[PDB]
Design a protein around this ligand. Structure first.
Ligand SMILES: Nc1ncnc2c1ncn2[C@@H]1O[C@H](COP(=O)(O)OP(=O)(O)O)[C@@H](O)[C@H]1O
Ligand SMILES: Nc1ncnc2c1ncn2[C@@H]1O[C@H](COP(=O)(O)OP(=O)(O)O)[C@@H](O)[C@H]1O
Ligand SMILES: Nc1ncnc2c1ncn2[C@@H]1O[C@H](COP(=O)(O)OP(=O)(O)O)[C@@H](O)[C@H]1O
Ligand SMILES: [Mg+2]
Ligand SMILES: [Mg+2]
Ligand SMILES: [Mg+2]
Lengths: 461, 57, 475, 475
């Protein structure tokens, strides 16, 4: 089926086809450029009068009205299986690593229905990250859905890179990384880092970064997800799915929304925000056939968690790491909110009675410190009771012991990174609550691994 | 000492009585600023939605 | 009868023809996918699609059914997981039933009702004592995420075990594995066999999220109009509202505050008014509603929260500050309301709860003096000691609903001063051991409250508690 | 297709009929010689944006295709010249004689075309070079209110590239032209103009030229990047560029979003700043470093346009008025400011002495605020150290310090050599110390110049102690 371009409006293209020869919605349509090369566009809306409105997957500059458009007869299909491992891809499933062809068995379409209710289950086993604040207060689950919330420049990318360094290094199964609407520098940094460590051989990489037009940023996560879905269903092996940043899928949809003919919703967003998010998100999951441990960076515009995009995303997660700027502004890294960060597996049944009690004890001390901050600021420190003065002292030490130097952030911290086991983390915060380190200064707790390292650091001061 | 203590606590009554009256004055000023911003935010948000809808039609 | 599609996009199809179609009529596309006529315009019919739309194109034909949307109802849906169309999702075969009801159905009138006088026990001490819910009432559960909203509804459903009350948990816009987790929790506590689970997950089309509460309401109404009693939970109406907004904006109906149309209030009021307490002439059955609202950063004055607050008979406000402190359930008693009030309680609970709401109000009002220890006069000294002890009784573990007879004795003990001698940290252990003592030995005092709905002889009850208090070992 | 006709025109926005097979985003030439840019290819008409004066462009004016995209002159001929976004000279020193040209629109280097940022771009400012270091190929936002010192940082950075073989490009967007003339004279007086290109789209210019100005300046920098040389580009500022793009979009009747900006306002700056990069050794190893500007209103970093540009760049330098007027100049907020390349952009000497400096001073400023509400020994020592370090990071405008001298000054204060010196004498101590080191201990400075590493710390400690014997404190 052949068509003709009648309008070009930025990333949107209207194509008139012959009567009774219309491409279905989500079909890939190729257009030969005048300059040279091929432009793939995806069918979005059937406007009427045999016209199909399409979202382009690359630049529409150079196009002319009247050019021929060819219906491929199916959605955007991309390579799957072990041929994708070690390779770097774009939105269309083409290799961008300059290492020859991709001899794949099959090519699956990027669009797909979500799994059945019968296929799904819950994630109960704990996944050790080696990061103190996460493992204690809001631990991740194996085959579960993890979300890394944060504002602009609070530490989502540094955190997800550390989780790759800690979790994916000694991982028996396979991995997938999806670069969605973020910095191309960081894709190059991560590729060469994975190449040096040897993790590249276990990992399929896809990139559709913020240089690209919206259509590329809209569908690049599906390209990566389709590869992860193969490793879950077809092969019998565990999968790690890293996405940075999933917000850019929603933003990409918001860019094309008004040009597709859709009236705007609240806060400048598309009216189909929740439906578009759900139909992508519900595919990202573990099933009875296989396990996907998904870790997704989630941008919070204007540091506003009430924003429709991050607010709607909260429903799709089993654990949430809530980054806040006020902690990052002090130098507390990772800047994890100890109260607002949550997990479905934070309970005595999973992590034990001691872990839950210590974790809850930390939250009550830090909650009481926040209630006193506004009182102390005006009326002074010495007007408090002896109980509250001790709570303030321990809260500030706890807050600093929640900080940690990362392996991937040595160029920012200026010191070596540290891995801390869970049983060691629980022991450290327990001794601080009991009052065994009340004579150590605050800086001793700042930027260390174990509680033993805090005792050693206090001697230097 | 007892007379000086009486003077101390009397002086604290007055000072913290003023600080209470000053806090209520400031709390009203902040409540005016809040409701100025709340009304302005809703006015702007709804105006941008309606402006966006009129651009299509 | 027949019409052809002009344009398709985003779960919406505009159809040429269908000249005698009804507003809200069920339509069938040629591939078997269903639709609903929402907009009747001069030259087309705006149809919302109740399924996948990738095979729907221009030139696709649509048929009239001549019927409004119905759902299967009755005993066959008990223990089952279904979608808003009544189709089973649990993978446990079909739903055999002759009984059907329409999704859109008129609520009982002013003369069809009787005042709400019967308790619907949640089993949660804070709710049952000071914010009581009655059979036929609509009580909003409202608060930010991770405040304990869903838990309260699940614990309420579990507490209906052996009370002859059919429960209905409607999930709107949730992750489907989270819904799978909820039904497993109900299964483990033996709550599922009298419960219907309606789920329209986030990947479902927007019309199913929109229609999910109405489908669950119809299933509850079957038991109401047959003389029985039922409970419906909408979790949540925020995501339902957003789904209806999506469709209205796509059908180009004019936007207002937060881009919602002018009939979004009408949407929720039409839903919630169908929950009611019928009169003796109409059989005396009831439907109790527990709608949810997820607020953002505590903004109760946002548009959709404001709508559902005014519609309902009361609100159970939850808060993050209380949740993080360890006050769980995290119920703010000061701002929470039940307009039905004492009428929804038995005589025993009504009598003991008067002092409880008085004591708890004075504690949180005079909490500024709490840090100034032992400088205060003995009037405010004992009230702070009493107040912090009543807070510990109002704390309650997850999935452990208490019978009303055990609640009233626990509230009676703390309010009359039988726990003033015992330390603050031992109050919760003192409660658990006291009720274990009362269940085993002094069952006659418990059984009096079960049968009569009133307190037993107070001096006999005082004697029973004092025997336990000597046997108890503090620490 | 041969010749088009202007059917309507207003506010520098013509609508053309006749051009059938015109390309998307094509350069067009009007009858009088003024150029234009065809935005959207609609079915009937073509919306053309005029790139120049529109006084003589009436209805019935002839338009013709060029068959090309928008293009600018590049190379050595632009060095020391003041041009507009089209490339036409405004200084009145003859025409720009050059054969090399580059387009306005050009793709960014891909994932495999880049190498990680590893080479310093020395600003000569201690606060930036130590705590928020910029590397060759990095994008570093300079953000803050009016009169906070943003332009001064960019001009001082440009001046510091004297003899370092880095071609600078200062892009003025929406400024008054007399201020741009003053900037040109400041570069002339400091002998920085020889290696600097001054692109200017003043406030009197049409909005399309303000819109197009950063892309023109980017293209002039890309020339040197792809040759294997290194270049720095300053966009002063992108707030006025975005405002000019908003004007452009609203005049073309494109649908408005937040603050009346179009949906692709993020994309505008993302594709611009992505073109700034550090190329791989395989593609020549050149670079383009970018200093975009944002003007905040009342310190509102969380506004719409500021957070878009923060989310694009590799960190930001945030300047505030309260710091500026309290004596902290440059007025860098250590907590909000950050570098996303970090230690990789510093030489090993700076990396070792200032590796933890930003985190230490972030902790200091929090502790300073908390201390105001009699402290202990270890905590009081941290405040005394931090207070002295703050004085070192203070610096006058137009006084660049070589990186070797910065290392010695930061090494001295962070290793406690100024603990016995009063706070008011720290800046005089620094000036006298470096003057002593230049005159008598240059081999220690020169070791840092040549190797990029610290000298022997034993010898360095002794050399600083030797200086202190001849220092007289005022207090
Ligand atoms: N764990 C950390 N330790 C030290 N510095 C950090 C850490 N996380 C973030 N930062 C600082 O903040 C910057 C921004 O981090 P990034 O992950 O890029 O933010 P975003 O949340 O926008 O992805 C980093 O370049 C670094 O300077
Ligand atoms: N009374 C309680 N005691 C202890 N934990 C609770 C209690 N109520 C709820 N929780 C826990 O706190 C979390 C609150 O989330 P949830 O009940 O889903 O509320 P929401 O629906 O508002 O997110 C759950 O993970 C639950 O296990
Ligand atoms: N380090 C400094 N020391 C003293 N004065 C400074 C310094 N930096 C900037 N200034 C002064 O601040 C004023 C504003 O500088 P400018 O760079 O124009 O700020 P902006 O571009 O943010 O408006 C100028 O008068 C300049 O002399
Ligand atoms: Mg990031
Ligand atoms: Mg919930
Ligand atoms: Mg300036």
């Amino acid at each position: 089926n052949k068509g003709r371009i009648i309008q070009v409006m930025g990333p949107v293209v209207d194509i008139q086809f012959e009567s009774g020869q219309l491409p279905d919605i989500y079909n890939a349509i190729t257009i030969e450029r005048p300059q040279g090369g091929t432009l793939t566009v995806e069918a979005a809306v059937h406007l009427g009068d045999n016209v199909v409105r399409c979202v382009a997957m690359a630049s529409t500059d150079g196009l002319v009205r009247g050019l021929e458009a060819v219906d491929t007869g199916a959605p955007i299909s991309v390579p799957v299986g072990k041929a994708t491992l070690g390779r770097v891809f774009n939105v269309l499933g083409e290799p961008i690593d300059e290492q020859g062809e991709v001899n794949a068995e099959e090519r699956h379409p990027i669009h797909r229905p979500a799994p059945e209710f019968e296929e799904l289950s819950t994630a109960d086993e704990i996944l050790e990250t080696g990061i103190k604040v996460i493992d204690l207060l809001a631990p991740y689950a194996k085959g579960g859905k993890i979300g890394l919330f944060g504002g602009a420049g609070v530490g989502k990318t540094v955190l997800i890179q550390e989780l790759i360094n800690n979790v994916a290094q000694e991982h028996g199964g396979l991995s997938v990384f999806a670069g969605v609407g973020e910095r191309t520098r960081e894709g190059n940094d991560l590729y060469h880092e994975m190449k040096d460590s040897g993790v590249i051989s276990k990992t399929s990489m896809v990139f559709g970064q913020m240089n690209e037009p919206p259509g590329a940023r809209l569908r690049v996560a599906l390209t990566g997800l389709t590869m992860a879905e193969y490793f879950r269903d077809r092969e019998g092996q565990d999968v790690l799915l890293f996405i940075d940043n999933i917000f850019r899928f929603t933003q990409a949809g918001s860019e094309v929304s008004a040009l597709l003919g859709r009236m705007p919703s609240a806060v400048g967003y598309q009216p189909t925000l929740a439906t578009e998010m759900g139909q992508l998100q519900e595919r990202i999951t573990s099933t009875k056939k296989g396990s996907i441990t998904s870790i997704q960076a989630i941008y919070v515009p204007a540091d506003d968690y009430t924003d429709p995009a991050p607010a709607t995303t909260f429903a799709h997660l089993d654990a949430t790491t809530n980054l806040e700027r006020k902690l990052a502004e002090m130098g507390i890294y990772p800047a994890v909110d100890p109260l607002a960060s949550t997990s479905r597996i934070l309970s005595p049944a999973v992590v034990g009675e001691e872990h839950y009690r210590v974790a809850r004890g930390v939250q009550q001390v830090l909650q009481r410190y926040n209630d006193l901050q506004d009182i102390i600021a005006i009326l002074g420190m010495d007007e408090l009771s002896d109980e509250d003065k001790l709570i303030v002292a321990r809260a500030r030490k706890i807050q600093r012991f929640l900080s940690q130097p990362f392996h991937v952030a040595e160029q920012f911290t200026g010191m070596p990174g540290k891995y801390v086991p869970v049983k060691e983390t629980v022991r450290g915060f327990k001794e601080i609550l009991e009052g065994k380190h009340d004579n150590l200064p605050e800086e001793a707790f700042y930027m260390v691994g174990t509680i033993d390292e805090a005792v050693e650091k206090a001697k230097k001061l | 000492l007892l007379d000086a203590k009486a003077s101390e606590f009397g002086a604290r009554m007055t000072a913290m009585g003023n600080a209470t009256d000053n806090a209520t004055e400031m709390l009203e000023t902040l409540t005016l600023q809040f409701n100025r911003a709340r009304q302005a935010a809703i006015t702007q948000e709804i105006a941008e939605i309606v402006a966006g809808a009129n651009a299509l039609r | 009868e027949v019409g052809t599609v002009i344009q398709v996009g985003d779960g919406i199809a505009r159809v040429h023809g269908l000249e005698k179609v009804m507003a809200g009529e069920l339509l069938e596309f040629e591939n078997g996918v269903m639709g609903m006529a929402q907009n009747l315009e001069e030259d087309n019919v705006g149809v919302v699609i109740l399924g996948p739309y990738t095979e729907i194109r221009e030139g696709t034909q649509v048929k009239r059914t001549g019927r409004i949307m119905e759902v299967p109802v009755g005993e066959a849906l008990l223990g089952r997981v279904v979608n808003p169309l009544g189709q089973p999702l649990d993978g446990r075969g079909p739903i055999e039933t002759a009984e059907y009801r329409p999704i859109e159905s008129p609520a009982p009138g002013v003369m069809d009702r009787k005042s709400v006088h019967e308790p619907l026990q949640t089993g949660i001490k804070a709710i049952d004592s000071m914010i009581p819910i009655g059979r036929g009432q609509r009580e909003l559960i409202i608060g930010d995420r991770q405040t304990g909203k869903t838990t309260i509804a699940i614990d309420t459903i579990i507490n209906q075990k052996g009370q002859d009350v059919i429960c209905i948990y409607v999930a709107i816009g949730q992750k489907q594995s989270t819904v799978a987790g909820v039904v497993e929790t109900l299964r483990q506590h033996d709550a599922l066999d009298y419960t219907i689970v309606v789920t329209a997950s986030a990947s479902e089309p927007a019309p199913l999220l929109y229609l999910a509460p109405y489908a669950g309401c119809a299933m509850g109404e079957y038991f109401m109009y047959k003389g029985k009693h039922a409970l419906v939970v909408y979790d949540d109406l925020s995501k339902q509202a957003a789904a209806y907004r999506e469709l209205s904006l796509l059908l180009r109906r004019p936007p207002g505050r937060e881009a919602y149309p002018g009939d979004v209030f009408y949407l929720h009021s039409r839903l919630l008014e169908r929950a009611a307490k019928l009169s003796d002439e109409k059989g005396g059955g009831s439907l109790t509603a527990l709608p949810f609202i997820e607020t953002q950063a505590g903004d109760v004055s946002a548009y959709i929260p404001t709508n559902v607050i005014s519609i309902t008979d009361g609100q159970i406000f939850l808060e993050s500050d209380l949740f993080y402190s360890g006050v769980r359930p995290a119920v703010n008693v000061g701002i929470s309301v039940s307009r039905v009030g004492g009428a929804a309680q038995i005589k025993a609970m009504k009598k003991v709860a008067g002092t409880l709401r008085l004591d708890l109000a004075q504690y949180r009002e005079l909490q500024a003096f709490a840090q100034f220890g032992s400088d205060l006069d003995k009037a405010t000294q004992a009230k702070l000691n009493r107040g912090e002890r009543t807070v510990e009784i109002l704390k309650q573990d997850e999935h452990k609903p208490m019978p009303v007879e055990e609640q009233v004795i626990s509230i009676y003990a703390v309010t009359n001063g039988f726990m003033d001698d015992i330390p603050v940290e031992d109050v919760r252990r003192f409660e658990e051991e006291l009720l274990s003592f009362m269940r085993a030995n002094k069952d006659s005092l418990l059984d009096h409250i079960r049968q009569t709905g009133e307190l037993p002889d107070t001096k006999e009850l005082d004697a029973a508690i004092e025997e336990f208090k000597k046997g108890f070992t503090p620490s």
